[PDB]
Design a protein around this ligand. Sequence first.
Ligand SMILES: *[C@@H]1O[C@H](CO)[C@H](O)[C@H](O)[C@H]1O
Ligand SMILES: *[C@H]1O[C@H](CO)[C@H](O)[C@H](O)[C@H]1O
Ligand SMILES: *[C@H]1O[C@H](CO)[C@H](O)[C@H](O)[C@H]1O
Ligand SMILES: *[C@H]1O[C@H](CO)[C@H](O)[C@H](O)[C@H]1O
Ligand SMILES: *[C@H]1O[C@H](CO)[C@H](O)[C@H](O)[C@H]1O
Ligand SMILES: *[C@H]1O[C@H](CO)[C@H](O)[C@H](O)[C@H]1O
Ligand SMILES: *[C@H]1O[C@H](CO)[C@H](O)[C@H](O)[C@H]1O
Lengths: 48, 49
Amino acid sequence: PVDTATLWTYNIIRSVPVPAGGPSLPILCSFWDGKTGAAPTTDAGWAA
Amino acid sequence: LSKPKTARTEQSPPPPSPSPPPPPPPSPRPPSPNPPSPRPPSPAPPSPN
Ligand SMILES: *[C@@H]1O[C@H](CO)[C@H](O)[C@H](O)[C@H]1O
Ligand SMILES: *[C@H]1O[C@H](CO)[C@H](O)[C@H](O)[C@H]1O
Ligand SMILES: *[C@H]1O[C@H](CO)[C@H](O)[C@H](O)[C@H]1O
Ligand SMILES: *[C@H]1O[C@H](CO)[C@H](O)[C@H](O)[C@H]1O
Ligand SMILES: *[C@H]1O[C@H](CO)[C@H](O)[C@H](O)[C@H]1O
Ligand SMILES: *[C@H]1O[C@H](CO)[C@H](O)[C@H](O)[C@H]1O
Ligand SMILES: *[C@H]1O[C@H](CO)[C@H](O)[C@H](O)[C@H]1O
């Protein structure tokens, strides 16, 4: 219903595994729920 | 489950702090001593008369 939370779960797969000795690959997932404003149109907006 | 994942109001905890440095190599060793100082000259025999 309107004004309740909902759980969106994303699973991501990389073609080649992260190097075993190196650091973890840090990702930032930017999310537009599909109902609010028009979503960022550039990578700068996604990174903001 | 009673309270779903949408109701987990806690905040995640930081990553592991780094691992300490290694120990140093054993220090060198104090310079070894010198060979005994050489004895002095040897007085020539009695002067003739
Ligand atoms: C002198 O004798 C030995 C080696 O000659 C020792 O390792 C030290 O270098 C010093 O005491
Ligand atoms: C980081 O950890 C906490 C758990 O306390 C929580 O699951 C957050 O959603 C997660 O990002
Ligand atoms: C060691 O580092 C981690 C994160 O890198 C954390 O902040 C600890 O508080 C710190 O002591
Ligand atoms: C040494 O310490 C950190 C945590 O403090 C981590 O476990 C490393 O894996 C270890 O090498
Ligand atoms: C002797 O040398 C070692 C280095 O190998 C140490 O760091 C200190 O300089 C001293 O204990
Ligand atoms: C004399 O010269 C030195 C001392 O000056 C040493 O004892 C020798 O044995 C002797 O010949
Ligand atoms: C006797 O011996 C001494 C040594 O000092 C010197 O050669 C003199 O010339 C000699 O007479």
